[PDB]
């Protein structure tokens, strides 16, 4: 209940969260190979970038995916991106999974339990979906915030119809373990700091997984 407020956000943080979760393109590729992982020639025909630089945190996390068949799903940014070919490189935090023995026979549609001021509301089953056994929290989070902004105007200002002032996204697993992200706890105001919550390549099993969402207009 002690969540961060929308009114306490920095100068351009709200507008940049809207870009990341609603407008900006996502780096989505299957079966590709490459503290960082450089995907040279990732973009084809793009006017800004050629390469994709993926940050995994440390060398130990990189060795797990370095030189092996890999799946990508994450938010990329160009501003303040360090590394690769200068001015022609896009950056990404995590969103890495091993390709082999990870594909699902039938697409799993992650159910959403949405609460607005304590009152439970319905979300269509097709909003958050994946074809992966072990999914990065980024993949599910990117889809869930896209729906929230499209339906409730999550990252729009109060003047623009954004009623939600407080929010919590809980990725509840079958055992009882939870991955919790405060919808308004923004690290800085730009995607280089904002997307750092995905630095730790947090992977969770899609089997018997549901998303618990708690929104507050107050």
């Amino acid at each position: 209940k002690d969540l961060r407020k929308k009114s306490e956000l920095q100068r351009n943080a709200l507008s940049n969260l809207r870009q990341i979760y609603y407008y900006n393109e996502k780096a989505i590729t299957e079966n590709k190979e490459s503290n960082t992982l450089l995907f040279k020639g990732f973009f084809t025909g793009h006017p800004w970038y050629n390469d994709l630089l993926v940050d995994l945190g440390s060398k130990d996390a990189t060795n797990k995916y370095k030189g092996k068949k890999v799946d990508l799903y994450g938010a990329y940014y160009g501003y303040q991106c360090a590394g690769g070919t200068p001015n022609k490189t896009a950056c990404m935090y995590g969103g890495v999974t091993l390709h082999d023995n990870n594909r699902l026979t039938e697409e799993k549609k992650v159910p959403i339990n949405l609460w607005i001021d304590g009152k439970q509301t319905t979300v269509p089953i097709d909003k958050v979906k994946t074809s992966k056994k072990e999914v990065t929290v980024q993949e599910l989070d990117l889809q869930a915030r896209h729906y929230l902004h499209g339906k409730f105007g999550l990252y729009n200002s109060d003047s623009f119809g954004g009623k939600v002032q407080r929010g919590l996204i809980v990725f509840h697993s079958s055992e009882g373990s939870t991955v919790s992200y405060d919808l308004f706890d923004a690290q800085g105001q730009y995607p280089d700091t904002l997307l750092r919550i995905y630095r730790d390549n947090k992977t969770i099993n899609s089997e018997n997984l549901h998303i618990d969402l708690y929104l507050y207009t107050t």
Partner: T-cell receptor, first 112, second 106 residues
Framework: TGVSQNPRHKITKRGQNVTFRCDPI?????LYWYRQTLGQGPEFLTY????????KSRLLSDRFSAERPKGSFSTLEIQRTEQGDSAMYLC??????????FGPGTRLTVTE | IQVEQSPPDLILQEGANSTLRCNFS?????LQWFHQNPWGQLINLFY???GTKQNGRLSATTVATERYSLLYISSSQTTDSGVYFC?????????FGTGTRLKVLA
């Protein structure tokens, strides 16, 4: 120049909403928005570098919202329009920022 | 920061030379000269944070130490009539001057 702006002219009632589009030069990573009142020079509103919004002035109030809806353009929305909003809305792009290349602009008139 | 253009209005005869001044308050990394036609289109003349540049009939000189830039128009034609602007980088956030309205007579 290679920078396009739509519409060229727009007339709206006081209190209504208005949206302007800016199509920059594809190779340019930076996008700028300016407001130009009759007689005066262009005043800085906001600016983007790649996907990120970098700066926002005091003139770009809560009634104003700028975004890059992916990926070859940008929009500028003004809610609950005042007669004081009646100005030339210019859009510029640059591959630095070094040399800013300006569009033709959107001429807005807010009538009672 | 602040940027002032001198003179505010200029009445010139055809074929005669003219000089437009631009004064800025702080150090500048990027300086640009523009020309605005009656339609409102801003035409790029020079990108000159320092030194000397020449583009045919037009030339520009920026003295970065004394915080000023000058725009020279040799053999002023009726086509050159309009509003000339000087814009400065606040170090990014660009600030345009008051402007100079050129009235080239026939």
């Amino acid at each position: 120049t290679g920078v396009s702006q739509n519409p060229r002219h727009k007339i709206t009632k006081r209190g209504q909403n208005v949206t302007f589009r800016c199509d920059p030069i594809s190779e340019h990573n930076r996008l700028y928005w300016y407001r130009q009142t009759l007689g005066q020079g262009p005043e800085f509103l906001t600016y983007f570098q790649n996907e990120a919004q970098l700066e926002k002035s005091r003139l770009l109030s809560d009634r104003f919202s700028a975004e890059r809806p992916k990926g070859s353009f940008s929009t500028l929305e003004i809610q609950r329009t005042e007669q004081g909003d009646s100005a030339m809305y210019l859009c510029a792009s640059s591959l630095g920022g070094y040399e800013q290349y300006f569009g033709p602009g959107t001429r807005l008139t807010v009538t009672e | 920061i602040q940027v002032e253009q001198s003179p505010p209005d200029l009445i010139l005869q055809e074929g005669a030379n003219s000089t437009l001044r631009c004064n800025f308050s702080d150090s500048v990394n990027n300086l640009q000269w523009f020309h605005q036609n009656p339609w409102g289109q801003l035409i790029n003349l020079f990108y000159i944070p320092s030194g000397t540049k020449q583009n045919g009939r037009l030339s520009a000189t920026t003295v970065a130490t004394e915080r000023y830039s000058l725009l020279y128009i040799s053999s002023s034609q009726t086509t050159d009539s309009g509003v000339y602007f000087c814009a400065v980088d606040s170090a990014y956030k660009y600030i345009f001057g008051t402007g100079t309205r050129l009235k080239v007579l026939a």
